[PDB]
Amino acid sequence: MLDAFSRVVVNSDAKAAYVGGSDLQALKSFIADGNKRLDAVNSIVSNASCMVSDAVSGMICENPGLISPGGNCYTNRRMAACLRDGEIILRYVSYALLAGDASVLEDRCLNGLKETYIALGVPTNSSIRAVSIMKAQAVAFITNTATERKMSFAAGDCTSLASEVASYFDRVGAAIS
Amino acid sequence: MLDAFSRVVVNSDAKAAYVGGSDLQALKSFIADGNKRLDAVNSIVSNASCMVSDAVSGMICENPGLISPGGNCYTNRRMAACLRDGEIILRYVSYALLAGDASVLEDRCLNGLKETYIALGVPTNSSIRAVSIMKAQAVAFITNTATERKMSFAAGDCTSLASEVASYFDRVGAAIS
Amino acid sequence: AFSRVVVNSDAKAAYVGGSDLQALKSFIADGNKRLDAVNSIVSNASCMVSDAVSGMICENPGLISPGGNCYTNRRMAACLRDGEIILRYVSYALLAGDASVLEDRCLNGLKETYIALGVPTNSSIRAVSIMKAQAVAFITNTATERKMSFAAGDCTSLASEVASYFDRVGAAIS
Amino acid sequence: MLDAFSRVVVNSDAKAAYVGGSDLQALKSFIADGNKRLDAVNSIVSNASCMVSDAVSGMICENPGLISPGGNCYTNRRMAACLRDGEIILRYVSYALLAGDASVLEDRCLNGLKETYIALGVPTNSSIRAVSIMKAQAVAFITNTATERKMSFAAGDCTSLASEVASYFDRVGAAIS
Amino acid sequence: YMGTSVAPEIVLTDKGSDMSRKVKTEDKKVAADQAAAMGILANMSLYASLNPVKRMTYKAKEQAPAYVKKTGNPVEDFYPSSWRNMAPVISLSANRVAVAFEKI
Amino acid sequence: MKSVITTVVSAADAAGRFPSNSDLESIQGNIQRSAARLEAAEKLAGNHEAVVKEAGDACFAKYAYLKNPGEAGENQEKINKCYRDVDHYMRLVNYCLVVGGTGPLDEWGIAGAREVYRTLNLPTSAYVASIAYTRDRLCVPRDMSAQAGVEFSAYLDYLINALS
Amino acid sequence: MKSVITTVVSAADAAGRFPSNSDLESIQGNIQRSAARLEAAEKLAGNHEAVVKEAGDACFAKYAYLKNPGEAGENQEKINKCYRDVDHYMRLVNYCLVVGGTGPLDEWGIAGAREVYRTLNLPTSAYVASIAYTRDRLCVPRDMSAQAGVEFSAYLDYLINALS
Amino acid sequence: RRTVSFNARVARNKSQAKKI
Amino acid sequence: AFSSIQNVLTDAPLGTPSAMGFLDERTEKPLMGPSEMDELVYAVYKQVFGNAHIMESERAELRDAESLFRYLRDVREFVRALAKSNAYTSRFLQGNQQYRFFELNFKHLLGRGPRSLEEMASHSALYAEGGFEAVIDAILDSDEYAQEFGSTVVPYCRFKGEYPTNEEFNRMLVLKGANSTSDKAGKGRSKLCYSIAAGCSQNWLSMSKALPFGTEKGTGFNLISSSRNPAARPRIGTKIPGGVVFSS
Ligand SMILES: *C(=C)C1=C(C)[C@@H](Cc2[nH]c(/C=C3N=C(/C=C4\NC(=O)[C@H](C)[C@H]4[C@@H](*)C)C(C)=C\3CCC(=O)O)c(CCC(=O)O)c2C)NC1=O
Ligand SMILES: *C(=C)C1=C(C)[C@@H](Cc2[nH]c(/C=C3N=C(/C=C4\NC(=O)[C@H](C)[C@H]4[C@@H](*)C)C(C)=C\3CCC(=O)O)c(CCC(=O)O)c2C)NC1=O
Ligand SMILES: *[C@@H](C)[C@H]1/C(=C/C2=NC(=C\c3[nH]c(C[C@H]4NC(=O)C(C=C)=C4C)c(C)c3CCC(=O)O)/C(CCC(=O)O)=C2C)NC(=O)[C@@H]1C
Ligand SMILES: *[C@@H](C)[C@H]1/C(=C/C2=NC(=C\c3[nH]c(C[C@H]4NC(=O)C(C=C)=C4C)c(C)c3CCC(=O)O)/C(CCC(=O)O)=C2C)NC(=O)[C@@H]1C
Ligand SMILES: *[C@@H](C)[C@H]1/C(=C/C2=NC(=C\c3[nH]c(C[C@H]4NC(=O)C(C=C)=C4C)c(C)c3CCC(=O)O)/C(CCC(=O)O)=C2C)NC(=O)[C@@H]1C
Ligand SMILES: *[C@@H](C)[C@H]1/C(=C/C2=NC(=C\c3[nH]c(C[C@H]4NC(=O)C(C=C)=C4C)c(C)c3CCC(=O)O)/C(CCC(=O)O)=C2C)NC(=O)[C@@H]1C
Ligand SMILES: *[C@H](C)[C@H]1/C(=C/C2=NC(=C\c3[nH]c(C[C@H]4NC(=O)C(C=C)=C4C)c(C)c3CCC(=O)O)/C(CCC(=O)O)=C2C)NC(=O)[C@@H]1C
Ligand SMILES: *[C@H](C)[C@H]1/C(=C/C2=NC(=C\c3[nH]c(C[C@H]4NC(=O)C(C=C)=C4C)c(C)c3CCC(=O)O)/C(CCC(=O)O)=C2C)NC(=O)[C@@H]1C
Ligand SMILES: *[C@H](C)[C@H]1/C(=C/C2=NC(=C\c3[nH]c(C[C@H]4NC(=O)C(C=C)=C4C)c(C)c3CCC(=O)O)/C(CCC(=O)O)=C2C)NC(=O)[C@@H]1C
Ligand SMILES: *[C@H](C)[C@H]1/C(=C/C2=NC(=C\c3[nH]c(C[C@H]4NC(=O)C(C=C)=C4C)c(C)c3CCC(=O)O)/C(CCC(=O)O)=C2C)NC(=O)[C@@H]1C
Ligand SMILES: *[C@H](C)[C@H]1/C(=C/C2=NC(=C\c3[nH]c(C[C@H]4NC(=O)C(C=C)=C4C)c(C)c3CCC(=O)O)/C(CCC(=O)O)=C2C)NC(=O)[C@@H]1C
Ligand SMILES: *[C@H](C)[C@H]1/C(=C/C2=NC(=C\c3[nH]c(C[C@H]4NC(=O)C(C=C)=C4C)c(C)c3CCC(=O)O)/C(CCC(=O)O)=C2C)NC(=O)[C@@H]1C
Ligand SMILES: C=CC1=C(C)[C@@H](Cc2[nH]c(/C=C3N=C(/C=C4\NC(=O)[C@H](C)[C@H]4CC)C(C)=C\3CCC(=O)O)c(CCC(=O)O)c2C)NC1=O
Ligand SMILES: C=CC1=C(C)[C@@H](Cc2[nH]c(/C=C3N=C(/C=C4\NC(=O)[C@H](C)[C@H]4CC)C(C)=C\3CCC(=O)O)c(CCC(=O)O)c2C)NC1=O
C-alpha cells in the first residue's frame, strides 16, 4: 500500500531521479495542512455508526422493494450484511483520507467488488445510493454543515479535504457500477 | 352512486358525476366516519398545486444530477413532463383516499408503470424519492401538522386516514420498485 | 467546464425563495457571512467601478489624451461597462464559492481580445487591482467614507477569498 | 439442504404466505404414505453392495474396451475408483428418496461433477449406463419384482415411489451429459 | 389507460350548511404545464449552484458547447453576441437571494 | 433448514454411510408427532390477524415510552412497522410447525437480528413482550388440543430464549 | 492494551525486527498530545462524582419506565448498582486518556459487554443515553482546555459507537 | 500418521500443571 | 476413501518421525538432527508461502520461529507462528481482496478449497471479532486440522476420494497449480470468488494443469460447452418390453 509521500517516491523512482525541491512543495504543503486533515478524520470515525444506520435505511426509503419477499435486504440475515458492508466502505475511505492516497482503498476493498456483487445478486443501483448518501454526510462534518451534531473545530477552509473525500466515494461508485 | 363513480373513470373519456345534499347524507351514515374522509381529501386537493411543486423540486434538492447536463430532468420539457406525472400520482392517491380502497389505483395508474419508466430511461430510484416527499406532505395535511399552513378542522383524531393515505403511497412505490 | 447554471438560451432569472434558503443557509458554513460580503459589494457596485477607472486616470492620464484608448466618450463608457462586468462575475464568484463560471465566461480569451482591440493590458491590471483593494475594505468594513451595519465577528477568510478571484483576473490579462 | 417439508415453506416465503390447509394436503399425504417411504429405502440399502457391482460389471459387459489398454476402467487402480463412485451415487439418491426432494443430490454430489470428469478423462456415456442399470435395479426392489430376492412387504402399490426414485437417477445423467 | 394522462379531479364545495356539500369526482386529462416548470427548474439550478457540499458528491457531466466557428477574430469567437455584456446581478433582500443574468 | 430429516442424513453423510436403521427409526417419530404440530400450524394460519393484533398492543401497554418522540414507535408508520415485524415472527412459527424443526426461525428470523436491532435502536424487550403474551393467551382445550399446545408453545419460547 | 507505544513494538516483534527511526518518530507525537490529554485526566478525576450524578439521573430522566416493578431498575439496590455501572466507564475513560489508547475500554468495558446486558435484560439504550449526556454537557472554554475537550469527546462516543 | 490418541496444547498444559 | 491418486501417483507426505515422542519422558521427540531437520523446514516454507521465494534478508525475521521449532518439535505451532508473521501478511493480506486472503488460508493450512458461501461467510464473521488472527487460530484449532494433520506432518494437499462435496475437489485443483506456480500472479483477485457466491464450478483446463503425472489431464472434453444447463429438462426413457417409459 501507498500514502501521499510514497506516491511521490515511486513516481520518481521510475525516472531514476532524486526528489528535488520542485516536487517537495506539494509535500511541504501537505504537512502544513496535515493537522487539519487529522482534525477532519475523527469527525467521520466518531459519527460512523450513525452514518451507516442512516445510509442503509435511507436506501430502504428510496427503493422499497428491497424489503419485499425476494428483495435483497429482505430477511434479518441479509439486513445485517448490508449494514456490515457500508461500515466497510466507510472504513476503507477513512484510511484513504488519513493516508492522502487512494491506493489502499482500491486494492483491498474495491479489488473485485463488482464481480462479488453480481454473483451474490446485490443490486448495483441501490448500492451506489448508499455510498452517495454517506458521501453527502462525509462532506457534512468537514464543511460543518450538519443539522444535528455540531462539532467544535477551528476556523478556516477545509473544502480541499471535502472535495478529496467526494473523489474517494465516487471511486467506489465507479467500481461497482 | 359510488359504483357510478367508477363509471366515470372506466369510459376513457370525460364524464362528471356528483352526489346531492340528501345523497351524501345517506352516504356518511352508510359508510363509517365519512365527514373525516371528505375533510381528508379536501386538505390534500386544496394544496395539491404546492404538493407537486415542492416534491419535484425537493427531488432535485438532494439529487441535482437530474438537472445536470446528461440527466433526465434536463432540457426544458422533461421537467414539465415530470411535473405532470407527479400530479397524475396525486390525483389517483386522493381518489383512492376518497373511494376508500386502492382498487382504482393499482390497475389504472400503476399497471404498466414500471415497464414504461424503464423503456423511457426514467430513473425509477428517484421517483420513489419524489413519492415519499408527497407521502410526507400528505400525513402532515391529514393530521394538520403542516408547519407553514394550518387549516380549520373540527376536533378529533385522523390517524387512521393518515395511515391509509400513507399506505397508498407505498403502493405507488412498490410498483415502480 | 462551467457551473450548475448552464441554462444558456433558457430561463435567466432563477431566484431562491425563503424556505429553500433555509435549506441553503443550513448547508453553507458561514453562509450568513458570505451573503453579507456579497451585499457589501453589490450595494456599492456603481461607486466601485467609477473610482477604479478614475483612479486609473489619476495614476495614468495618458488615456484621456487623443491617441489614448479612453478618449471618445463611448470608449470611456465601454471601459465603464467592462469594469462592471469584471466586478459582477467576481461578486458572483464570492457567492458561489468558485471561479469556474468566471474562468469560462468572463476571463476566457480576455488576453486575446484586449490585444485585438488595442486595449492597454497594464492599465487594466491597475484597474482590477484598485477594485481588489476596495472590496477587501468593503468586506472587512474598513471602508473609510461609508461603514455598513453588520453583526459582530470576523470576515478575514472571505476577504482572502475575494483577493484570490481578483488575482485570477490579473493573471488572465497579464 | 432441504426435504419435502422444507421445500413447501420456501415456496410460501416468496409470497410471504402462511402454510394453510390448501397447501397442507400434499404434506398430510406425505406423512400418510410415510411408512411406505421407509419400507422402500431399506429395500435399497439392504441390497446396495449387490446393486453396485452388478451395475459396474454390467457396463463392462456391453463395452469391453473399458478394460483393454487405454480404457478408463483398466487396472485395479482405476476399477476400484469406478466402484467407489457408483456407491457414492447410490448413497446420495437414497438420501434424496428418504427426504423426498432432490436438493442434497444436486448440490453435494452432482454440482461440479461434469468438470471433474472432463479433467480426469472419465467417459460419460458409459457412466450414464452404470447409473441406468441401477435405476432399473432400484425399481425392481421397490415393487418387489426382482427375480431373486423377494423381500417381505405389505400389500398395495409403491408405484409413485418407484417413479420418484427413477427421476432422481435421471438427474445424474442430466448433470454429467 | 396509462399514457392518456387522465386523472379523477375531486372538488369539494362547502358553505357550512347541510345542503351545500357536494363532491364532484369528474375526469380531466391533466396537462404538462410548461411555464411553471421554469419556476422549479431554474430555482433548483441556483439552489444547487450555491451548495458547497452538493457541488461535490454530486458532480455533473462534461457538457459539450455549441459549434462556434472560431471565425478568427477573438472578439466574436470568445465573446459572442448571445453572451455579449451579460453578467449576473445579485439582489438580496429578506429571505431571498435573487440573482439575475441580464445585459448591463 | 434444520429438522428431523436433515439431521439424520447429514449425520449419515459425514460418516460416508447409507441410511441405516437408526435413521429410519427417527422419521417414524416424524410421522407419529405430525398430527399435533400440523393442527397448531393450520390454526395459526387461519387466525393470524387477531393473534398479532393482541400481541401488538400488549407491547405498547407495557412500554408506553416508545410513543415518546425520538423513540422507536414515534409515528404511525413506525407503529405499522412494529405490527409487521411481529407478523413476520408468527409466520416463522407457522413455518417451524410445518417443517418440524427450528430451521426457519434461526436463519430467517434470528440470524443477524441482534445486530440490526442494536443499530436501529429497537429494544429486544419489546419484542419478547409480544411473544410472551401469546404464550400465556393459549389455553388447553379451546384454542387447540392438549398436544398441539405443547408443540406451539415450544417454538414460541425457543424464540424468547434466542432474543434473551 | 492497545496504545501508541505497544502498537509500534508489537508490529516490530511481529515483524521480527529492531525499532528503527520510523517508530521512533511515532512517539514524538506521543510527547505533543501528552500535555493535552493529561489535562483532561485529573479534570475528570476530581470531578467524577458530580458528572455521574449529573449523567446517571439523565437515564432515569429519559426512561422512567425503568423504575416500574418487574423492570430493570425496580429498587434502590438496582439504582445504586446503576450509578456504579456508569462510574466504571468514567474510571475507564480516565485510563484511556492516560495510556493514550483505546485499550482499557476495549478489554475491560466493551469486551463481552453485549452478552451480559442481553442475558440480564439491562437495556443498552440507557447506557448510551448517559454517555450522550456528558458528550453534550461539556463547554470547552469553561471545563478544560480547547484540545482536552477534543480528547474527552473522542473517547465518549467511542463508547457510543462500540455499545451500538 | 496422525495417531488419534494425541493432543497438541494440553500437552503443554499438564507438564506445567503436575509441577504446580 | 480409497483415492486412486494419493500414495500411488504423488509422493508420501513429509513430517516428523512419530507422535509417541511427546509421551517419552527423557526426550520430547525422536531428535532429527540438522540435516534431517532443515529439509523438513524446506517443506514448511514451500507450503505456507506457496513458492514465494523468500530471500536471505526475509528469512532472518523468521529466525525465532525455527529456533523454537527445533526444541518444541510441534509442526502445528510452527505453522501458527509463520502465519502471524509479517512475511505472511505482506504477501497474502496486504494487496489482496478479502476472499483472496480467505481462499489462500484454505490452501496453505488445509490443502482444500472452501466448500460453501456459508462456510466462507463465517470466516468473515471471525474477522469482525478479532481480525486476521481469529481466522488463523480457528483453522489451526479446528477438528478438521486435528484429524488430518495434527502435530506430526506438514499440511499437504490430500487426494481423499470421499470429498463431502464434489465441488471441493474442483476448488482444490484450481488453488494449487503446477510446481512452477506461485500465488501472486493475479493482481489480488480471488479465483474462486465468482463460483462460491453463485454456486457454479470451475474451468476444466485450469484444474487439469494441477493434476499429477499419469491421470489423463484434459481428455474427455467434448467440443460443445463445459458446464451444465440448470434449466434443461431432458427426456431419458427406459426400454420395457412393450414400449419406452419416460419415468419423469
Ligand atoms: C432544499 C432546501 C429543499 C427541501 C428539503 C425540499 C423541502 C421539503 N419539504 C418537505 C415537507 C413538507 N412540504 C410541505 C408542502 C408545503 N408546505 C406548505 O405549506 C405548502 C402548502 C406546500 C408547498 C410549499 C408540507 C406541508 C411538508 C411537511 C411539513 C414540513 O414543512 O416539514 C419535505 C419532506 C419531508 C422533509 O424531508 O422535510 C421535503 C423533502 N424542497 C427544497 O427545495
Ligand atoms: C485620483 C484622482 C484618484 C485616485 C488615485 C483614486 C484613489 C484610490 N482610492 C482607493 C481606495 C478606495 N476607494 C473606495 C471606494 C469608495 N469609497 C466609498 O465610500 C464609496 C462607496 C466608494 C466610491 C467613492 C474604498 C472603500 C477604498 C478603500 C479605502 C481607502 O481609502 O483606502 C484606491 C485603491 C487603494 C490603492 O491600492 O491605492 C485608490 C487608487 N481615486 C481617485 O479619485
Ligand atoms: C447520523 C444520525 C448522523 C447524521 C447524518 C446525516 N444524514 C443526513 C441526510 C440524509 N439522510 C437520509 C436518510 C433519511 N432520509 C430519508 O428520506 C429517509 C427514509 C427514507 C431517511 C432515513 C438521506 C437520504 C439523506 C440525504 C443526503 C443527501 O442526499 O444530501 C444529514 C444532512 C445532510 C448532511 O448534512 O449531510 C446528516 C448530517 N445526522 C446526524 O446529525 C448524525 C451525526
Ligand atoms: C475543517 C475540516 C474544519 C476546521 C479545521 C481546522 N482544524 C485546525 C487545527 C487543529 N485541529 C487540531 C486537533 C487535531 N490535531 C491532532 O493532532 C488530532 C488528533 C490527535 C486532532 C483532532 C489541532 C491540535 C489543531 C491546531 C490548533 C488548534 O486549533 O487546536 C485548523 C487550523 C489549521 C492548523 O492549525 O493546522 C483548521 C482550519 N476548522 C473549521 O472551521 C472547519 C469546520
Ligand atoms: C445383485 C446380483 C442383485 C440383483 C440386481 C439386479 N440386477 C438387475 C438387472 C440387470 N443386471 C444387468 C447386468 C448383467 N447383465 C449383463 O448382461 C451382464 C454382463 C455383461 C450383467 C452383470 C443388466 C443389464 C440388467 C437390466 C438393466 C436394464 O434392463 O437396463 C435387476 C433387475 C430385475 C431383473 O433382473 O429382472 C436386479 C434386481 N439381483 C438380485 O437379485 C441381487 C440381489
Ligand atoms: C411397497 C414398497 C411395498 C409394500 C409396502 C407397504 N408397506 C406398508 C407398511 C409398513 N412398512 C413398515 C416398515 C417400515 N416402517 C418403519 O417405520 C420402518 C423402520 C423404522 C420400516 C422398514 C411398517 C411398520 C408398515 C405399516 C404396517 C405395519 O405396521 O405392519 C404398507 C401399508 C400401507 C401403509 O400403512 O402405509 C404397504 C402397501 N407392500 C407391497 O406390496 C409393496 C411391494
Ligand atoms: C417525474 C417526477 C419523473 C419523470 C417523468 C417523465 N415521464 C415522462 C413520460 C411518461 N410518463 C408516463 C406516466 C404517467 N403519464 C401518463 O400519461 C400516465 C397514465 C395515466 C402515467 C402514469 C407515461 C405513460 C409517459 C410517456 C410514454 C409515452 O408517451 O409513450 C417523461 C418524458 C420522457 C421523454 O420525453 O423522454 C419524463 C421526463 N422523469 C424523471 O426524471 C422523474 C423521476
Ligand atoms: C381529519 C382529517 C381532521 C378532522 C376531521 C373531522 N371532521 C369532523 C366533522 C366535520 N367534517 C366536515 C366537512 C366534510 N363533510 C363534508 O360533507 C364535506 C364536503 C365534501 C367535508 C369537507 C363538517 C362540516 C363537520 C362537522 C363540523 C361541525 O359540526 O361544524 C370530525 C368530527 C367527527 C365527525 O363528525 O366525523 C373530525 C374528527 N379533524 C381533525 O382533527 C383532523 C385534522
Ligand atoms: C476599461 C477599464 C478598459 C478598456 C475597455 C474596453 N473594452 C472594450 C470592448 C470589449 N471588451 C470585451 C471583453 C469583456 N467585456 C465584455 O463585455 C464581455 C462579455 C461579458 C467580455 C469578455 C468585449 C466583449 C468588448 C466588445 C467587443 C465585442 O462585443 O466584440 C472597448 C472598446 C474597444 C473599441 O471599441 O475599439 C474598450 C475601450 N479599455 C481600456 O482602455 C481600459 C483599460
Ligand atoms: C463579513 C462580511 C461581515 C460580517 C458578517 C456576519 N454576518 C453575520 C450574521 C448575519 N448576517 C445576516 C445578513 C445576511 N444573512 C442572510 O441570510 C441574508 C439575506 C437573507 C443576509 C444579507 C443575518 C440575517 C445574520 C444573522 C444575525 C442574527 O442571527 O440575528 C455574522 C455572525 C455569524 C453568523 O451568524 O453566522 C457575521 C460575522 N460581520 C462582520 O463583522 C464582517 C464585517
Ligand atoms: C414492534 C413490536 C417493534 C418495532 C419494530 C420496528 N421495526 C422496524 C424495522 C424492521 N423490522 C425488521 C425485522 C423484520 N424483517 C424481516 O424480514 C423479519 C423476519 C422475517 C423481521 C422480524 C427489520 C429488518 C427492520 C428494518 C427495515 C425495515 O424498515 O423494514 C421499525 C422502523 C425502524 C426504522 O425505521 O429504522 C420499527 C419502528 N418497534 C417497536 O417499538 C418494537 C421494538
Ligand atoms: C550463544 C550466546 C549461547 C548459545 C546459544 C544457543 N541457543 C540455542 C538454541 C535456543 N535458544 C533459544 C532462546 C531464544 N530463541 C528464541 O526463539 C527465543 C524467544 C523468542 C529465545 C530467547 C531457544 C528457544 C532455543 C531452542 C530452539 C532451537 O533448538 O534452536 C542453540 C542451539 C542448541 C542446539 O544446537 O541444540 C545454541 C548453540 N549456546 C551457547 O553455548 C552460547 C553461550
Ligand atoms: C393461533 C392461536 C390462537 C390463540 C392462542 C387464541 C388467542 C385468542 N383468544 C381470544 C379470546 C379469548 N380467549 C379466551 C380463553 C381464555 N381466556 C381466559 O381467561 C382463560 C385462561 C382462557 C380459557 C382457555 C376467552 C375467554 C376469550 C374472550 C375474551 C378475551 O378477549 O380474552 C382471541 C380473540 C378472538 C376470539 O375470541 O376467538 C384470540 C385471538 N386464538 C387463536 O386463534
Ligand atoms: C470533567 C468533566 C466535567 C463536565 C462535562 C462538566 C459537567 C457539569 N456541568 C455543570 C453545570 C453547568 N455547566 C454550565 C456550562 C454550560 N452550560 C451551557 O449551557 C453552556 C453552553 C456551557 C458553558 C460552557 C452551566 C451554565 C452550568 C450550571 C447550569 C446547569 O447545568 O445546571 C456541573 C455542575 C457543577 C459545575 O458547574 O461544574 C457539572 C458537573 N463539569 C465537569 O467537571
| Under 8 Å between Cβ of I175 and I107 | yes
Look-up of cell digits 478614475: C54
- Beta-carbon contacts of residue D39 (< 8 Å; ≥ 6 apart): D153, D154, D158
Query: The dihedral of CA F80, F82, F84, F87: what is its sign?
Result: negative
The C-alpha atoms of residue F28 and residue B173 are separated, in whole angstroms, by 49
Q: Is F82 annotated as a binding residue?
A: yes
Query: The dihedral of CA I39, I44, I50, I53: what is its sign?
Result: negative
The C-alpha atoms of residue B68 and residue D97 are separated, in whole angstroms, by 61
- Please state, in angstroms and as integers, the Cα–Cα distance from residue A53 to each residue in A118, B135, F78, following that order: 24, 22, 16
The C-alpha atoms of residue F83 and residue G1 are separated, in whole angstroms, by 45
- Beta-carbon contacts of residue C31 (< 8 Å; ≥ 6 apart): C24, C25
DSSP H or E stretch at residue F40: helix F39-45
The C-alpha atoms of residue F55 and residue F62 are separated, in whole angstroms, by 11
Half-sphere exposure of G158 (CA within 13 A, CB side): 21
Q: In A42-75, where does DSSP find H-type helix? A: 48-62
For the record, the C-alpha cell of D22 comes out as: 390448501
DSSP H or E stretch at residue E27: strand E23-29
| Under 8 Å between Cβ of E12 and B41 | yes
Q: Is G65 helix (H, G, I), strand (E, B) or coil?
A: coil
Strand partners, E7: E28
Residues constituting chain E? 104
Query: The dihedral of CA E18, E23, E24, E28: what is its sign?
Result: positive
Number of domains in chain C: 1
Q: Which of B71, B74, B57 is nearest to B129 (CA)?
A: B57
For the record, the C-alpha cell of D146 comes out as: 426382482
- Please state, in angstroms and as integers, the Cα–Cα distance from residue E36 to each residue in B57, B84, D162, following that order: 12, 11, 73
The C-alpha atoms of residue B126 and residue B69 are separated, in whole angstroms, by 17
For the record, the C-alpha cell of F44 comes out as: 395459526
Of ligand 12's listed atoms, the one at least distance from the Cα of I69 is 27
DSSP H or E stretch at residue E86: strand E86-90
The C-alpha atoms of residue B73 and residue B123 are separated, in whole angstroms, by 10
- Please state, in angstroms and as integers, the Cα–Cα distance from residue D3 to each residue in A147, B72, D173, F5, following that order: 53, 49, 22, 7
Give strand ranges (E) for chain C: none
If you ran DSSP here, which 8-state letter would residue E96 be given?
A: B
Half-sphere exposure of I109 (CA within 13 A, CB side): 29
| CATH code that applies to domain F1-164 | 1.10.490.20
- Please state, in angstroms and as integers, the Cα–Cα distance from residue D150 to each residue in D46, D142, D146, following that order: 12, 10, 7
The C-alpha atoms of residue I16 and residue I30 are separated, in whole angstroms, by 8
Contact B70 E20 (CB under 8 A): no
- Beta-carbon contacts of residue E90 (< 8 Å; ≥ 6 apart): C38, C39, C42, C91, C92, C95, E97, E98, E99, E100
Contact A63 B170 (CB under 8 A): no
The C-alpha atoms of residue A93 and residue A104 are separated, in whole angstroms, by 9
The C-alpha atoms of residue F127 and residue F73 are separated, in whole angstroms, by 13
The C-alpha atoms of residue E19 and residue B24 are separated, in whole angstroms, by 10
The C-alpha atoms of residue I235 and residue I248 are separated, in whole angstroms, by 8
Domain span holding position A128:
1-177
| Under 8 Å between Cβ of I172 and I42 | no
The C-alpha atoms of residue E82 and residue E85 are separated, in whole angstroms, by 9
Strand partners, E99: E90
DSSP H or E stretch at residue G39: helix G39-45
For the record, the C-alpha cell of B61 comes out as: 434538492
SS (H, E, C) C68-106: ECCCCCHHHHHHHHHHHHHHHHHHHHHHHCCCHHHHHHH
Q: Which of I161, F20, F17 is nearest to D91 (CA)?
A: F17
Q: Is F78 helix (H, G, I), strand (E, B) or coil?
A: helix
Strand partners, C68: C66
For the record, the C-alpha cell of G44 comes out as: 475528570
Look-up of cell digits 493475479: I186
Query: F144: Cβ below 6 Å to ligand 13?
Result: no
For the record, the C-alpha cell of A120 comes out as: 451474490
| Under 8 Å between Cβ of B99 and B34 | no
The C-alpha atoms of residue A130 and residue A138 are separated, in whole angstroms, by 12
Chain E residue numbers touching C97 (CB-CB < 8 A): 50, 52
Query: How many Cβ atoms are within 10 Å of F78's Cβ, its own excluded?
Result: 14
SS (H, E, C) chain I: CCCCCHHHHCCCCCECCCCCCCCCCCCCCCCCCCCCCHHHHHHHHCCCCCCCCCCHHHHHHHHHHHHHHCCCCCHHHHHHHHHCCHHHHHHHCCCCCHHHHHHHHHHHHHCCCCCCCHHHHHHHHHHCCCCCHHHHHHHHCCHHHHCCCCCCECCCCCCCCCCCCHHHHHHHHHHCCCCCCCCCCCCCCCCCHHHHHHCCCCCHHHHHCCCCCCCCCCCCCCCCCCCCCCCCCCCCCEECCCCEECCC
Structural method: cryo-EM
| Under 8 Å between Cβ of B67 and E44 | yes
In the structure, do chain A and chain G come into contact, i.e. share 3 or more CB pairs under 8 Å? yes
- Beta-carbon contacts of residue F94 (< 8 Å; ≥ 6 apart): D18, D19, F41, F44, F45, F48
Q: Which residue lies with its CA nearest to atom 21 of ligand 5? A: D58
Note every long-range contact of C145-150, with CB atoms under 8 Å and residues 24 or more positions apart, other chains counting.
C146/C44, C148/C36, C148/C40, C148/C43, C150/C36, C150/C40
Q: Is I70 exposed, middle or buried (0-12, 13-18, 19+ CB in 10 A)?
A: middle
Q: After which residues is chain B broken (C to N over 2.5 A)?
A: none
| Under 8 Å between Cβ of A95 and A105 | yes
CA of A123 to the centre of ligand 2 (A): 62
**C-alpha torsion angle, residues F114, F119, F122, F127 (rounded to 10):** -10
Q: What Å resolution does this PDB entry report? A: 3.3
With b for 16 or more beta-carbon neighbours within 10 A and e for fewer, the I228-244 pattern comes to beeeeeeebeeeeeeee
Of ligand 3's listed atoms, the one at least distance from the Cα of A148 is 41
Query: C139: Cβ below 6 Å to ligand 10?
Result: yes
Q: Is E99 helix (H, G, I), strand (E, B) or coil?
A: strand
CATH of the domain at B137: 1.10.490.20
For the record, the C-alpha cell of B140 comes out as: 402532515
Q: Is E12 helix (H, G, I), strand (E, B) or coil?
A: strand
**C-alpha torsion angle, residues I128, I132, I134, I137 (rounded to 10):** 160
Strand partners, I53: none
Residue type, G75: N
Look-up of cell digits 445485517: A80
The C-alpha atoms of residue G64 and residue G69 are separated, in whole angstroms, by 11
Q: What are phi and psi of C15, to 5 degrees?
A: -80, 170
**C-alpha torsion angle, residues G61, G63, G64, G70 (rounded to 10):** -150
For the record, the C-alpha cell of D70 comes out as: 487405454
The C-alpha atoms of residue D45 and residue D56 are separated, in whole angstroms, by 17
The C-alpha atoms of residue F40 and residue I172 are separated, in whole angstroms, by 47
Q: Which of I121, A76, I122 is nearest to F118 (CA)?
A: A76
- Beta-carbon contacts of residue C57 (< 8 Å; ≥ 6 apart): C63, C64, C70
Look-up of cell digits 510446481: I179
Chain A residue numbers touching E54 (CB-CB < 8 A): 136
* One-character DSSP codes across D108-144: IISTTHHHHHHHHT--HHHHHHHHHHHHHHHHHHHTT
B130 alpha carbon, closest ligand? 7
D145 alpha carbon, closest ligand? 5
Q: What are phi and psi of E99, to 5 degrees?
A: -75, 155
Put simply, whether A166 touches E (Cβ < 8 Å) is: yes
Query: How many Cβ atoms are within 10 Å of B45's Cβ, its own excluded?
Result: 20
The C-alpha atoms of residue G26 and residue B148 are separated, in whole angstroms, by 56
For the record, the C-alpha cell of F40 comes out as: 397448531
| Under 8 Å between Cβ of G113 and G60 | no
If you ran DSSP here, which 8-state letter would residue D150 be given?
A: -
DSSP H or E stretch at residue E29: strand E23-29
The C-alpha atoms of residue C136 and residue C40 are separated, in whole angstroms, by 10
- Beta-carbon contacts of residue D99 (< 8 Å; ≥ 6 apart): D1, D2, D3, D4, F5, F6, F9
In the structure, do chain H and chain G come into contact, i.e. share 3 or more CB pairs under 8 Å? no
The C-alpha atoms of residue E7 and residue B92 are separated, in whole angstroms, by 6
Contact E57 A140 (CB under 8 A): no
Residue A122, by phi and psi: left (phi above 0), alpha (psi -120 to 50) or beta?
beta
| Under 8 Å between Cβ of I235 and I208 | no
For the record, the C-alpha cell of E63 comes out as: 457538457
Q: Is F46 exposed, middle or buried (0-12, 13-18, 19+ CB in 10 A)?
A: exposed
In chain G, where the domains are located: 1-164
For the record, the C-alpha cell of A135 comes out as: 458521501
Q: Which residues lie with the beta carbon below 6 Å from any ligand 11 atom?
A: A 57, 60, 67, 74-76, 79; F 59, 66, 72-73, 78, 81-82, 85-86, 88-89, 108-109, 116, 120, 122-123, 126-127, 130
Half-sphere exposure of C73 (CA within 13 A, CB side): 0
